[PDB]
């Protein structure tokens, strides 16, 4: 419901969970979706620390 | 090395075969000059 300001941006840590990026990538709600060092279509079968 | 496409091939003549040639040369030198 509420977002942070740009000067005091908010860091949320995501961990110990199973992600699903197909719900984000295949959504039409986003005007910008730019990935660096990783391809959005491959992001759905990788693991991160 | 092996697992990166790098291999080593064996010599055609074995160490035993080389030793045999050496023995023949020594035997010749000693008995027939």
């Amino acid at each position: 419901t509420r977002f942070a300001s740009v000067y005091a941006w908010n860091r949320k840590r995501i961990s110990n969970c199973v992600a699903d990026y197909s719900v984000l990538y295949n959504s039409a709600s986003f005007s910008t979706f730019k990935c660096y060092g990783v391809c959005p279509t491959k992001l759905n079968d990788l693991c991160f620390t | 090395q092996k697992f990166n496409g790098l291999t080593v091939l064996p010599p055609l003549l074995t160490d035993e075969m080389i030793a045999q040639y050496t023995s023949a040369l020594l035997a010749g030198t000693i008995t027939s000059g």
Partner: protein, 49 residues
Amino acid sequence: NFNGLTGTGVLTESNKKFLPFQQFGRDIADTTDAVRDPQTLEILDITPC
């Protein structure tokens, strides 16, 4: 594919004594030659076919 790490080879049980914080080992070629199974925590040796 181990936690996102893809490759081909023969897997066997390892006798390498990994410390609890270590998940894999590497060779001089920067290739992985041992991994910790993410579910069983067993250490496996990786040798090319």
